[model samples]
Target: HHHHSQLENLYFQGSDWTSECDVLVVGSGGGALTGAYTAAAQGLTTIVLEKTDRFGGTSAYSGASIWLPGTQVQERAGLPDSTENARTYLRALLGDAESERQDAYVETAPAVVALLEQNPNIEFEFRAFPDYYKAEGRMDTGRSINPLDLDPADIGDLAGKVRPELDQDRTGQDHAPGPMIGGRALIGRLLAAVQSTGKAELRTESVLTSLIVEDGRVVGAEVESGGETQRIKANRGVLMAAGGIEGNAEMREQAGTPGKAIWSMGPFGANTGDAISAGIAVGGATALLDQAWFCPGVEQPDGSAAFMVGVRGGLVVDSAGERYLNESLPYDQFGRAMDAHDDNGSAVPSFMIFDSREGGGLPAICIPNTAPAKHLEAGTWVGADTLEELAAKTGLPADALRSTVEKFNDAAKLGVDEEFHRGEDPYDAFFCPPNGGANAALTAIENGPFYAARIVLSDLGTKGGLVTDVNGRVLRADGSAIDGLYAAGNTSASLSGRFYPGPGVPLGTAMVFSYRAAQDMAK
Candidate 1:
């Protein structure tokens, strides 16, 4: 009966032709690495294959922070964040939109944190950062979480495939901490743990090109490594942790969320959605193609890209000459506000206006701390004595631009933005400053030497892909589980439903579901 059960499991879980192993994990992002480590720790032989030449996938290139709420970090910090509150927050975000399979995720997330924390291979520190949606109110204040610390130099062999930390772009025109920050540290730590185990193998430049199926059951996969094709067999299961399709312009256009701007200070070159496409070709369903992990970016004078959130000295507006959402709101909200408008809407091809005070080199909003200060003392960014001259130099409709500035100045004097409510939110205050102790958002627009740049709603990556169970099991069209196959990260369904719940939701959901998949496999 035991033998029969094992055979049934093998058949139920799909594997294909190739080299055989106890388990196979695709991609090396946070989720994939976690799943691989978990499966290996269970005493199963494990192999992790990455499409890109790196181990971290997009996560390594990202802020690398994992939002593990209600964990030891929160306890140590004396911040009050409970699992129940997290559940309620998720419930509010997902509403009735989730299936029964999604429940295991909410319930087991705390357990996942516990396992990683005690595992010696992984650890997390709760950051006092507030939830991006904290203004809406459901959880404790300053309740966000992050990984403690991970230095890439510590990963040893795994570091060979990992992308270099983008520390140079840490600060820009905005005076904020670099976007990648401590997040990249976590990626380093996770990779180091995987490498130290010797229980798992990290293969870089290895691509899972196709799944080898036998009679509708998965057995293994055909992979391409160093221009050679090979097959690997999976005795237990396969987990897909590959990132999403943001780098694929074709996929982006098909999804109807084509980006007018392309900057990936986050993770760009390595996210090709290979796992997603491979799974779909084998009967996986998809969701949220129109959705994305949205954020703003800058086209630097050096042609490099930088992420921006709420640095001072700039104005963002839509095509209709109106500001829609709070420029200081979380990136997802800002993106949604942009998405709310159609391609022709004012949000597209928007404009960010500043003065020589900004273009001369003000630190940017996205990564505030490390950016350079505006070179106002040197006079690189031009200043105009009149609005008409400024508009003409900036290539905007001189008359319309002048009129808009006059109206904004009038509103500034009134200390209220009747149109967009610029400083209405707490987050907005971080960007706007006080003029002589008054709110900066209430400052007049009468300053001379105005500068303007073309802006658009850009994204970090696409958000939708193959549908998976709470256990990370990919489901067939009939809603039945495709045994032996699982997915997470951008390659799977987003539990946050249609809207982004908060910062780290993508990585957090990936962490929870990957842990669940490991548990189910162990059972």
Candidate 2:
């Protein structure tokens, strides 16, 4: 009997070739598509394999802000962003660790954006989003940029290939209104740009199962598609941009990352750690396995989690009905605060209390317009005419919530949060009403018919996987590159370590390193 498993028994020579390309990209998110676009631009044949029926992965469901610094876009917007400033900010956040990777990231980030924009299909405009941290060189009004909205006519046939927006508002459905915004727009433009190149092919519903090794070098991949397994060769390299393990509960547990699979914002049936596992099976190393790109999630009635951000008017309370953190903290930091209070998951379901002045909707644009009704009917939201009644409905001590609101209301009038300093940070006021009030993020909870929504630990995705070098090539435990193997996006260990540095670090770094990987392969 053979000691190896069924996967090990398979040989590429006997398998039929469904397709072949100079570069094979696993997953069609921003990172993978960027790599494909770059390779194809260099006259290299490229193929993008997506596991889901639709493309874009979690990236399509995101804000699609690429946190690239010192770019032409920022310069045009009159923002003073430079590589040195970015280096300073990153150094303040990540320190001397991973300096090489960090340097490569900063250096190539501008080029990634510059090269992509050369294609008329891909356009970027800077937006004012705040950096996550309050470190030196940080942009209070952020330096991140977003893709220009694309016309469906420009995208043509590939317009139908991009994943629908998370809220389904911009899914390009017959009745869905407005142009695609955020991640959908970004993915749409990239997909159009990639397809515009006749040399690049995008294959959806193709799932990468394992890497095919020839003499200890990755030569191709085994993929399952249309109920059949096929082998595809990658003459130059295989770029694994397939995302992380946030959607896999077992894998999340094994990695010791906090948050449940149900609470992850990753697209359904995606980010199961398939690429990471495939890399490891071939002797690749891993790091930062215990961390994730965390965010606060409001659990919906349908049991799905909606990522919550920008609390314009609300206060989050723990089980004791006590405010333990600044409600306006960055989503990831807020999630960390929740984890800090978790006692056997006691904090699994916290509460966000808001008054009728904010309406009964969630504090952010997390779901569709019909979500409020569903949340109420499903008992995810508890409402009452008085703080006492709301407290009782939410199983919190009435006196505790009552006192908490009283203090908060007083601070709102004074425009100073004495306890948590809710509106002190520029980030805290980014989403607040700019009515020239006492504090943008501070509001009295005296409006009647108060409501409380259930909060949970949620994540964009886990941020750890196959370890890679500055060149985006996957490495073994001994710190040597695995020949012909490369990884980017969430499939590789993050260079940011345990902290989230800025708004678009995920997409930014993914695009940069994937670009670098393609350049390295071109040689």
Candidate 3:
């Protein structure tokens, strides 16, 4: 009775409820918007709450590759992908960890894509990003579907509300004068779709501070916005897909999550684990709090890091000036390799040994695309005419650096990375162009004007939070579902557990569970 009274004490009176909705969706990222759109389309009066002025969070910075196997997009593209195949792929990597949730993800993904495609604002196309692993059920040319580019004129005034791409936003500039692509298009289109329902209210700069619990059920939320705190009731359910602790230094330290808060690639300070912390305040269970969608990052001019991928023409060396892992691995795997080899603390700030290839730009693709000059000026990148000079600039052993370079160049000539097996996987050569070299991903690093850039661990977002079930219902520590509460995206501990399976597993899992959450709420 005392416990019940404690919960009831947090419940507000009828007069204290400033607003109410059938479904209260927290966070405005891909998963949150998808849940809102689903709920509103079902004739439920839904409300979406965003913490910041903009709509999308880290998802907006993504390339928007969504892996929804056995969907119309894949079938239309004539791929061999199916839900069974996806399930097999997930099982291969995760090995029955959270099996029910795994089943839920693959089974619901098709319906999620279908429901989203029903909206006139949404359309997807097949892209050729390769699956990260060479396991059973893996598609060589990835099966992830991407949102089509959206014109700003289509979304009208709503265009300005969508979060701009990282490069533009970081520079305090407006949207580029082209069709919005990648994460921008995905968020913009989803926002437009949610608006077209005409039964949803979208509010920005509204922060969900706490939940109102009554009789062990979530009844509403306390949101602080416009210099006021309002008790907003949710008659059906409250879905928190807000995000994880990627932007919170304290939480990161507590969770033992690798990387600095400043190095996280999410919109800076946007996702501070607010929704996850809110859920925890209500007895929600959590897992994998140390996990993240990790990636190799190029240290930027202002101390931030840019997501780096697709290393086509260089060898990455550890602090001991030796080639360690395959540079051509998927970014997440690459980041993990960086972390794994950091037992010596040398790999965190490792150097990527490159040459004047591609006109002196990075051998890999770097988000925000800073010029080489800026990196050099900022001391994030160093260059020299000889290997010894580069070694001197990077404070590495000249003998070790030269030996590493010679061995890598020999591998390039032989098209066989005897050290790390760089060009073995299909994903390795995905970004490489056809060169006269035996392996496109194995180009020699023997040109003059050698360069080395600082590489650090970064993440798209933290991947761990509240623990949830198949229907996206948040559960307590003893395996009891929390009434009228659901979570997805980075707000929930990712269903994939410790592995990043494919190109878009993060977005795919987020969208599927968010959709499933809305479906359950409608029941």
Candidate 4:
């Protein structure tokens, strides 16, 4: 009953005319939007609240790959992806933990995609990405699908309300010149579909502060918008898909989540864990607090971090000036490798050594294409005519770097990575240089003028928060559902444990559970 004070305080006595909805969804990312859209389709009046003025959160900045298996698109693409196969893959990655939730995800993934595509505004195409793992029943190419590019004209003025892609090279900015691709496209199409329902309302600049509960059931929320607090009542339930604490430095530190706020690729000022806090206040349990969708981040001169992946050429080394993990491992695994070697911050700023053979450019697709020159100018990247000079400039032991490169060069010539097996997995060669060699990701660093860029721990977002059951109902420590309260996306503990089985596991689980939550609410 002590929690009643906090919940009651959030009730605005000033306004008795509570804006009511059948479903109240917090956050406006893919998960939140999916919840709203599904609820609306079921004849529920849905209201979507966004913290910022824009609709898309960090999701808009992503590649928008939804890793759903056994879809019609995958079948059309001649891939042998099925629900049974997905179960095998998930079992290999996640074991018996959350088996019910994993089965729910596998069972409902294709249905979620199907429902979204039924809307005229939503369309998708199969794209050739690789599964992160080389497990049984894993698709070597990938089963992820991308939302079709959306024209601004189709979405009307609502198009302006969407967040821009991260490629634009600036933080806190939400306008990109070209047609929105990747996550922006996904959000745009979803926005249009939700709008077409005419039963869903989207309100930006609506920051949810607290949950309103009555008789052990969540009934509404207190939202701050336009310099005033408003009470919005939900007759069915409240769904929190407001993302994780990736952008909140204080929260990240408190949770002991790896990666710094400065290195998070989550949109600035988003995913501050407000929803997570609200859930926790009501006795919600949590899990996987120390994990994130980790990746190697290149520190830009603008003092921001850019997610770096799919390295075609470069060798990542620690302070000991030695190669540790497989340089071509999937981004999350590579980041975990860095985390393992982070002995007193020795791996905090690892060096990525490359050479002029590839024109001395930065490897991989760095967001904000203007980062390389700025990196060089700001001393974040060092260049020299020889490996020894580059090592000296980067504060590495020159002899060690020289020996490491010599060993790597010897293996490169033989078209094999005997040490780390760089080009062994299809994902390892997903972004390798075309026509570089027999082993695309195994190029040597002998071509002088050598270069080294500083690498840091970064993340797509934190993957832990409020714990939820298979249907996305936020659960208590006793494993009982909190009545009328549900959570999806990064707002909930990841169902995959600490493993990233494929691209879009985050979004895939987010969508499926959000859909399930809405369906449960509609019932």
TM-score of every candidate relative to the true structure: 0.85, 0.96, 0.97, 0.96
- Give model 2's TM-score versus the native structure: 0.96
Candidate 3 accuracy as lDDT: 0.89
lDDT digits (tens) for residues 1-523 of candidate 4: 1122145434444455259999999998899999999999879999999998789798888889997788876777787778899899999888999999989998888889889989999988889888898788788888888898887888898888888877652655666677778888889988888989999999999988878877778888878888897888899999999999898888888889999878898888778888888899878999887899999998877667788877888888898789998888898999999999999978988888888876868777766555556678899899999888888888899999998999988878888988899988899888985655678888877777888898899899999999998889999999899988999999999988889999988988988999999999988
> Candidate 4: deviation at residue 1, Å?
22
User: Using lDDT as the measure, which candidate wins?
Assistant: 3
Ten-residue region with minimum lDDT total, candidate 3: 1-10
Clash tally for model 4: 0
Q: For candidate 2, what is the lDDT? A: 0.85
Cα lDDT, model 4, residue 414:
85
TM-score of 3: 0.97
**In what order do the candidates fall by TM-score, top score first?**
3, 4, 2, 1
Q: What shift in Å separates residue 6 of candidate 2 from its native position after superposition?
A: 8.4
- How large is the C-alpha RMSD of every model relative to the true structure? 6.0, 2.5, 2.5, 2.1
The whole-model lDDT of each prediction reads 0.64, 0.85, 0.89, 0.86
Model 2 over residues 208-306: C-alpha lDDT tens digits? 987878778888887888988877888999999999988889888888899888888888668889999889888899998889999889887767688
Off by over 4 Å in 4: 1-5, 8-17, 169-174
Return model 3's CA RMSD, one decimal: 2.5
Q: Write the per-residue lDDT of candidate 1 for residues 417-491, one digit (tens) a residue.
A: 777776665555655555652456555555455655544456666778888876888898788887778888888
Instruction: Point to the candidate with the largest TM-score.
Output: 3
Any idea what lDDT model 4 has? Answer: 0.86
